[model samples]
Target chain A: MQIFVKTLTGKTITLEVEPSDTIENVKAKIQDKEGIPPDQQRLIFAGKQLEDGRTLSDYNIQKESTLHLVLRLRGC
Target chain B: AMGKIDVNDWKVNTRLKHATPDSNIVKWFWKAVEFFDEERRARLLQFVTGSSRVPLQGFKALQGAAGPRLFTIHQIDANTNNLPKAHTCFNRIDIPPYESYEKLYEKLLTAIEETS
Candidate 1:
């Protein structure tokens, strides 16, 4: 499936991956992009679900899907 | 007392006009957002998806159309908010059909009408 991740700040980036990938794998990919760890990372899609080991296809996802990469942790 | 920002350092807020709906929608939205996270956002998004009106008469949208197959109406609550802000751009486009902005306007008119 097509994966495009965007931050709440309106920053978007596209990725090439099959829908068969696990949620864990998706986290890894995102970590690579943001340079953060998957465990502490909060990857939410469509404003719900903390996204884990589910397949993109299982989620009825396809190419060009716009994912919102929200910040899981905040600092004062 | 009021707060002020430097002329060189200005921020912006929502602005709704004869054109869009997201701004107005998000205002009451941030209010509810100003409410909390997860549960509140869900609740607030619902408020916007369904209601999308804030500060009652502080701002209103005038859809210059005949409506239905067309679009119209924009109203708000003035008792709860300040006059329109110079920098606030509360522009928005209602949710449409499933409840586009026209719904927000209709609801606001009914809200004020009920009071009047």
Candidate 2:
């Protein structure tokens, strides 16, 4: 399935994944694409935290589904 | 004016742009972070997922000193169809800053041939 990642700032990035792929895999791809670390991402899909171990199909994520990505970077 | 910051005094606002139809499209998308949040951010995101345009009541998205104003964040995604074409229109618009919400809405509606 293909999912759209919409950042809090309204920027969007697309990811293509399979139903068997874990949510962590998606976050890893986001980390690669946007340079945002997986731990720094607070991803929510349908208003729920996207668990790293869960598969996309476990959440019923369909094609064109948008996963909201909120980057939570800690600072001094 | 919460979340207001002065990094050498550039109060940067969080932003999101709308993807629209052809010439019937209006070129626009800008913002202020203080007046923007999860509550104010989801209006247009809903539209992208096939919802009607949601209007904001008594809000100040323009800046800190502005009064409450009525405005609708119009949004549309023209790429719903995944045609095998290799072309897409993704560029966006500008106006003399501080324009009225109604004026901007009117311009957008006129361009899209829609009524408020």
lDDT winner among the candidates?
2
Across A1-76, the per-residue lDDT of candidate 1 in tens digits comes to 4688876556676777887887778877876665444653456666666468677776766788777664432111
Question: iRMSD per model?
Answer: 18.1, 16.4
Which candidate number maximizes DockQ? 2
B1-116 per-residue lDDT for model 1 (tens digits): 12221111111233334425445543442342343434433322222222223222222321211321111113333222111111112222232121333433333322222110
Residues B1-116 of candidate 2 have per-residue lDDT tens digits of 34322211221222223423221222323322133354333332222212222223112232211332222222333221110011001111222221344443433222222110
Model 2 over residues A1-76: C-alpha lDDT tens digits?
A: 6789987657788998888989889888886776555765667889998888898999989899999986432111
CA deviation > 4 Å runs, candidate 2: B1-116
Docking class of 1: incorrect
Worst lDDT run of 10 residues, candidate 1 chain B, spans B79-88
Name the runs in model 1 displaced over 4 angstroms: A74-76, B1-116
